[PDB]
């Protein structure tokens, strides 16, 4: 089997991407944030505290004939950006772009933190990291991809995120028309539950390539590119007027400035992030100060190849017995 779904930016800055997901019988369609940095499929629901729902579409298990309470199961998650949610668990039928899993753990939110409430466009998350990170207790649950894997034509999914435009998540096949050149594959460590790999270095604009190992994660659920402070400093030093602002929480730059590209290494191959991808617009309406899309990972404790990086590539998440990651230009 295979599946193919369009993923759409939630706003004009590509702050995140939502993908429609069918849950239950008859189908309830929710727009989920596909997140290769976490491993819980959780949704706004009929059980979510009413005061914490503001415009989201909810899953109502009682209206699904295939929904079954996973008795005794609870979940509770906290994300790197300080947000959180928690609740109980049902199993139900979940379909993504034609691909159907039965008995998928659908984690129903009883509580969500304010940032989720305040984002009316995201109805939940669908985690695509390794199932070892799943928070369901007492019995850890498998991700949608893990459950689908054996049925797929090939044990892979791909992320093709658009710049200011829709893109595609595919399951079970590699669309050879979706990228240019060849796919370069690189080793993955699953020891922290992430799609963790080691970039071979970077360049800033037309600068020479610096060969240096950068361990990080391929994370569709993180907006920006978070790299070591040395690297980030070298980038923003090439932007006139750029500065790091504690009050704003990172590097900002005059909206009148031209951003250089940023290149990262995948083995001997190179992915080029165009400068425009690194512009996240005015820090506040009317401000001439723009927020940068490359920021320091210092104090996150991990480097994160978020959407800024991934949307410059066609990315293969190869869930073979020994997982690997593939990157192609597009």
Swiss-Prot record:
Residues 17-328 form the Peptidase A1 domain. It catalyses: Hydrolysis of proteins with specificity similar to that of pepsin A, prefers hydrophobic residues at P1 and P1', but does not cleave 14-Ala-|-Leu-15 in the B chain of insulin or Z-Glu-Tyr. Clots milk. Its EC number is 3.4.23.22. It is an enzyme of class 3 (hydrolase). Disulfide bonds join 255-290. Keywords: Aspartyl protease, Disulfide bond, Hydrolase, Protease, Signal, Zymogen. GO terms for molecular function: aspartic-type endopeptidase activity. The keyword Protease applies. It comes from the Eukaryota. The active site is at residues 35, 199. Coiled coil: none annotated. One of its GO terms (biological process) is proteolysis. Belongs to the peptidase A1 family. This is Endothiapepsin. It comes from Cryphonectria parasitica (Chestnut blight fungus). The chain holds residues 90 to 419 of 419 of the full protein.
């Amino acid at each position: 089997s295979t599946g193919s779904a369009t993923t759409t930016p939630i706003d004009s800055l590509d702050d995140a991407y939502i993908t429609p997901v069918q849950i239950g019988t008859p189908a309830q369609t929710l727009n989920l944030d596909f997140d290769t940095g976490s491993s819980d499929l959780w949704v706004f629901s009929s059980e979510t505290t009413a005061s914490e729902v503001d415009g989201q579409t909810i899953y109502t298990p009682s209206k699904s004939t295939t929904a079954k309470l996973l008795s005794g199961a609870t979940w509770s998650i906290s994300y790197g950006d300080g947000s959180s949610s928690s609740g109980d668990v049902y199993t139900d039928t979940v379909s993504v772009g034609g691909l159907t899993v039965t008995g998928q753990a659908v984690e129903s939110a009883k509580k969500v933190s304010s940032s989720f409430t305040e984002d009316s466009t995201i109805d939940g998350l669908l985690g695509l990291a390794f199932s070892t990170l799943n928070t369901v207790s007492p019995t850890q649950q498998k991700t949608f991809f893990d459950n689908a894997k054996a049925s797929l034509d090939s044990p892979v999914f791909t992320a093709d995120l658009g710049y200011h435009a829709p893109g595609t998540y595919n399951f079970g096949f590699i669309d050879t028309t979706a990228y240019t050149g060849s796919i370069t594959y690189t080793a993955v460590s699953t020891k922290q539950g992430f799609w963790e790999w080691t970039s071979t270095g970077y360049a800033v604009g037309s600068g020479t390539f610096k060969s240096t190992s950068i361990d990080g994660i391929a994370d569709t659920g993180t907006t920006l590119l978070y790299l070591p402070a040395t690297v980030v400093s070298a980038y923003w030093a090439q932007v006139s007027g750029a500065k790091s602002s504690s009050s704003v929480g990172g590097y900002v730059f005059p909206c009148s400035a031209t951003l250089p590209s940023f290149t990262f290494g995948v083995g001997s191959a190179r992915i080029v992030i165009p400068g425009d991808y690194i512009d996240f617009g005015p820090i506040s309406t009317g401000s001439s100060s723009c927020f940068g899309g490359i920021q320091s990972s210092a104090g996150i404790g991990i480097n994160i190849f978020g959407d800024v990086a991934l949307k410059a590539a066609f990315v293969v998440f190869n869930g073979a017995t020994t997982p690997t990651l593939g990157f192609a230009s597009k």
